[PDB]
Amino acid sequence: VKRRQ
Amino acid sequence: SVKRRQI
Amino acid sequence: GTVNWSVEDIVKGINSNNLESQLQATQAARKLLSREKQPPIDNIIRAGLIPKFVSFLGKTDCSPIQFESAWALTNIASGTSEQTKAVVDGGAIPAFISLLASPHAHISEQAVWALGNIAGDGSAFRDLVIKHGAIDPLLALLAVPDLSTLACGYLRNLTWTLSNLCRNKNPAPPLDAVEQILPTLVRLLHHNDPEVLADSCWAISYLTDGPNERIEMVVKKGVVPQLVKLLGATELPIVTPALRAIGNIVTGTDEQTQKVIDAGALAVFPSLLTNPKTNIQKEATWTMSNITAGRQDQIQQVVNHGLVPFLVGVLSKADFKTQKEAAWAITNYTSGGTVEQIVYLVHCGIIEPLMNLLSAKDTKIIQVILDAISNIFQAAEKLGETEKLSIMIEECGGLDKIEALQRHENESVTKASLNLIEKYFS
């Protein structure tokens, strides 16, 4: 569940 | 900004 | 001599058919455009001077007027998109690229600067500068055995312009352009000038701001150890883009994230998570949140490096945007971690600062926190210790927060509210 910038 | 003015 | 000319006098000299009169009028325009307070860029544009400046770029037998007109156009291009467009519309892009090979270093440098301003406007002008063929002659200026032999300002300007060719998405720069630039970028990332290092990291931060395939192009160049080294620099202008690049890389695959851990990045985060600059603390916690979204062995590295107490710290006291990132780190941790890892999180004191943040009004952080509480209860179910966690939550006022949250305006928070009370608080 990565969250981009 | 990523622009530069030369003084 | 050429100080404080009116635009009218500049136009008169430039239209004069006298090359020396034109040179003096162009220098006067340069000095006007180089003053600190409100350069009259629009006045110069409206006078129709850009086509004449562009034609002066090609006067090989008078290098002073090439320099002065390049400087004048550089500063016009430093303005708004409209003002940069006027420079491009006058045909300046191929003229400046031609000047990159000038034998006069100060003229070559001026063309580098101008192209950096044009490419820096946005992806369209960036890609237009690339289509005109700027990358080959720009990289050739750095084709020396040791960068230390180049003039300091010359090298800083080239690094900045190259970084603008790496900047922006929608779309990202052409893949072949990125591949052509990267080896020089890697070389600049190992240079010993702080400004070159800062702009090299910014360039890498741009190239890693995208899908995993873009991150992989950078990670495969072996630059992660150098990025981690720059993470520990004393200069904030270096740490900021280095941290941005590292944080971008850990948004990729578990394997790309592992390269960051392998390089020793976690050892810097006690400093980063307590850094007095709010933005560093926020982006370091964001980075931590994407690492705790990884594999259980990567969560374990966060544990081994003593970073869970630091996450408790930022959750307890930080800028609210940093606290929101800390909440994400906790929910990601509790979503992928083992029972033991989740137990260790409670032992470090995560519960009370978690409950205290349920007073916030940012509806998303409440959803994030409520998810984390459910995840921790699910681990406490496997140990049969839900009643112990319920006592912890009610003893620090958390039950009063959840029991008053079933009447919230968002509905996914009211459903999560009531579900927790029905199962564990009855």
Residue numbers in the entry:
A (entry chain C): 298 to 302
B (entry chain B): 297 to 303
C (entry chain A): 72 to 497
Provide text from the study.
Impα is an adaptor protein that links the cargo protein to a carrier protein (importin-β; Impβ) that, through transient interactions between Impβ and NPC proteins, translocates the Impα/Impβ/cargo protein complex to the cell nucleus. Consensus sequences for these two cNLS were proposed and correspond to K(K/R)X(K/R) and KRX10–12K(K/R)X(K/R) (where X corresponds to any residue, but positively charged amino acids are preferred at this position and hydrophobic ones are also acceptable), respectively. These sequences bind to Impα through hydrophobic and polar contacts with two binding sites, known as major and minor binding sites. NIT-2 NLS (915TISSKRQRRHSKS927) and PAC-3 NLS (281FDARKRQFDDLNDFFGSVKRRQIN304) peptides, corresponding to regions of N. crassa NIT-2 and PAC-3 transcription factors, were cocrystallized with N-terminally truncated M. musculus Impα lacking residues 1–69, variant α2 (MmImpα, UniProtKB: P52293). Similar to other Impα structures, the major binding site is located at armadillo (ARM) repeats 2–4, and the minor site is located at ARM repeats 6–8.
The crystal structure of MmImpα/PAC-3 NLS presented two fragments of PAC-3 NLS peptide bound to major and minor sites. Electron density is present for seven peptide residues (297SVKRRQI303) at the major NLS-binding site, bound at positions P0-P6 of MmImpα. Electron density is present for five peptide residues (298AKRRA302) at the minor NLS-binding site, bound at the positions P0′-P4′ of the MmImpα. The KRR residues were modeled at the positions P1′-P3′ and Ala residues were modeled at positions P0′ and P4′ due to the lack of electron densities for their side chains. The residues bound to the core of the minor NLS-binding site (residues KRR; positions P1′–P3′) have higher average B-factors (61.0 Å2) compared to Impα. The presence of electron density for only three side chains in the minor NLS-binding site with higher B-factors compared to the entire protein indicates low affinity of this region to the protein or peptide staggering. Taking into account ITC assays with PAC-3 NLS and the previous structural studies with Impα, we suggest that peptide staggering is occurring with N-terminal sequence of the peptide (281FDARKRQF288). The calorimetric study demonstrated that the PAC-3 NLS peptide interacts with MmImpα with approximately the Kd value considering the experimental error and with the same stoichiometry of 1:1. As both mutated NLS peptides were not able to bind to the protein, it is possible to conclude that both clusters are necessary for the interaction between PAC-3 and MmImpα, thus PAC-3 is a bipartite NLS, as previously suggested in the study with PAC-3 and NcImpα52. Thus, the structural and calorimetric study with MmImpα complexed to N. crassa PAC-3 NLS revealed that this peptide binds to mammalian Impα.
